């Protein structure tokens, strides 16, 4: 569990688990490559406990724009949706606001846990990027949906040993390039 611990004079916040570290009778505490305490010897029973920091991450808000709709989706970056769901049920998350979190609106992305958007199989061009191929948009009763973005339409080329395509017409096109 995520708890506030105080072992003798070393205090902190973290999750204590049974360790797999080969402590000698000599060592009392452990540290990783960046000199952060990550293991302790329990003053009683001498159990060696690993300290995992409590889960955290950034929060992103996906908004269609307030001139269209006031519904938003929340991405909890960096964590598994199982831990977010448990934190919601336990009322442990630092933000005090909540999202409806109804069935089918919680989707696991590579970026994080996306709550408040319906994932669909149909692929669309990317609108609001989320990450790892997943984008969100506001579409139909309009609601926020999430999808794996399309890269483009397919166009097979009619290649053959003796077939060539020759233009019979042309277009004169004018494009705009803006440079600071």
């Amino acid at each position: 569990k995520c708890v506030n611990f105080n072992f003798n004079g070393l205090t902190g916040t973290g999750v204590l688990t049974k360790s797999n570290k080969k402590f000698l009778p000599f060592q009392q505490f452990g540290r990783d490559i960046v000199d952060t305490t990550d293991a302790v010897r329990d003053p009683q029973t001498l159990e060696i406990l690993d300290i995992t920091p409590c889960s955290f991450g950034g929060v992103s808000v996906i908004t269609p724009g307030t001139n269209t709709s006031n519904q938003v989706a929340v991405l909890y970056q960096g964590v598994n949706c199982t831990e977010v769901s448990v934190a919601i049920h336990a009322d442990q998350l630092t933000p005090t606001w909540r999202v409806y979190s109804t069935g089918s609106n919680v989707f696991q992305t590579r970026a994080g846990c996306l709550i408040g958007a319906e994932y669909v199989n149909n692929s669309y061009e990317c609108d609001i990027p989320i990450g790892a191929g997943i984008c969100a948009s506001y579409q139909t009763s309009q609601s926020i949906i999430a999808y794996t973005m399309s890269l483009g339409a397919e166009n097979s080329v009619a290649y053959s040993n003796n077939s060539i395509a020759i233009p019979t017409n042309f277009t004169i096109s004018v494009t705009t390039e803006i440079l600071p």
Binding site: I166, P167, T168, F170, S173, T176, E177, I178, L179, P180
Partner: protein
């Protein structure tokens, strides 16, 4: 007449596209917004205490004896100096980015406006014909006029035409067939022409070339001579 009409239509569409879309000029508006934000942030930093009892120097001088007033003022000096130093560093980085953009714009102007660039996608999408500069606040806008192929048709082709045992290759073009007759055409615009000894060149016998087809190459001189001499 068709080309002039397409050009005029494209220019009108460009004016309408820039007018209609609020984000068309985002690249320059972002530069303006970043400079305005940098100055507003730099001014707002003067309000911060940076650990001092007050952001106003006169309050520090009026409240404390010289020793503590100097300590609190030195703390504010450190805070403001760090804020200015950060501002200048960020402006140096932004200036380097703008320099790179300006060098690209100058290259685009030389290659696209003062000449006809062969570089693909450098002077717009399509085959480059010409470009026109327009000025803009803090920047330049280029109108790139290009040739885009349209309405293609697929034809049967061959690398060479075999006449009297000799392999004929296009001088400037590609051999195409409509299903009954073979013609030489330019690659970028369908315009069939009769295959003659003036349009093709001869190198080697009809064996090595893979996919050579049999057809007649029309030599004009012989045809005239068979009339001249009778």
């Amino acid at each position: 007449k068709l080309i002039a009409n397409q050009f005029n239509s494209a220019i009108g569409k460009i004016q309408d596209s820039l007018f209609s879309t609020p984000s068309a000029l985002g690249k320059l508006q972002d530069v303006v917004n970043h400079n305005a934000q940098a100055l507003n942030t730099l001014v707002k930093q003067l309000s911060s205490k940076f650990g001092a009892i007050s952001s106003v120097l006169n309050d520090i001088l009026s409240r404390l004896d010289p020793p503590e007033a100097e300590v609190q003022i030195d703390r504010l000096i450190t805070g403001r100096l760090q804020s200015l130093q950060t501002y200048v560093t960020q402006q140096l980085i932004r200036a380097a980015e703008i320099r790179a953009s300006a060098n690209l714009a100058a290259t685009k102007m030389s290659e696209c406006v003062l000449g006809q660039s062969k570089r693909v996608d450098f002077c717009g999408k399509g085959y480059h014909l010409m470009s026109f500069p327009q000025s803009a606040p803090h920047g330049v806008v280029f109108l790139h006029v290009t040739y885009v192929p349209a309405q293609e048709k697929n034809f049967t082709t061959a690398p060479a035409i075999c006449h009297d045992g000799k392999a004929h290759f296009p001088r400037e073009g590609v051999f195409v067939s409509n299903g009954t007759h073979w013609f030489l055409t330019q690659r970028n615009f369908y315009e069939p022409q009769i295959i003659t000894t003036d349009n093709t060149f001869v190198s080697g016998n009809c064996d090595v070339v893979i996919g050579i087809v049999n057809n007649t190459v029309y030599d004009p001189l012989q045809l005239e001579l068979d009339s001249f001499k009778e």
